[PDB]
């Protein structure tokens, strides 16, 4: 029954497969065990902060319809997907339906 979860297995190890040989001098990096120990320390820090430090709140606006369908404006810099302009129009129309 665990069988159909193989895409995660490919997601983890294919990235290891696409690492070239060290002496081909593409980047000249071997960061396996270094990252192992560094991430062990980093996870200690992260868990400690999550338990005994400031934690961002998860409260949000959960009643207003389509509140988080944010359309482009000077507050978003217009660097989005090109064809999302249609979406903006839709959002505009929706926000005029709920006044």
């Amino acid at each position: 029954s665990w069988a159909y979860m193989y895409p995660w297995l490919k997601f983890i190890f294919r990235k290891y497969l696409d690492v070239p040989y060290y002496w081909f001098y593409l980047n000249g990096r071997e960061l396996g065990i270094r990252v192992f120990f560094t991430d062990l320390k980093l996870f200690f820090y992260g868990i400690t902060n999550r338990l005994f430090d400031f934690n961002p709140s998860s409260i949000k606006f959960e009643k207003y319809p389509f509140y988080y369908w944010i359309n482009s404006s000077q507050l978003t810099e217009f660097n989005q997907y090109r064809k999302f302009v249609i979406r903006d129009s839709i959002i505009y129309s929706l926000n005029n339906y709920i006044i």
């Binding site: 029954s1 159909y4 979860m5 895409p7 995660w8 997601f11």
Partner: protein
């Protein structure tokens, strides 16, 4: 971009009955040492359902 990654939370909620029957089967086999057939029919019927 077709990674075909499925959510682990949904998978975990999917996994409950199989682990349940595994644990119930182990309890049934361990308690067979000091239990009778009619007293274990509860576990057998639960695993069947």
């Amino acid at each position: 971009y077709k990674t075909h990654l499925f959510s682990w939370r949904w998978f975990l909620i999917k996994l409950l009955p199989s682990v349940s029957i595994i644990l119930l089967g182990y309890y049934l086999q361990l308690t067979l040492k000091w239990n009778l057939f009619n007293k274990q029919n509860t576990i057998v019927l639960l695993i069947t359902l």
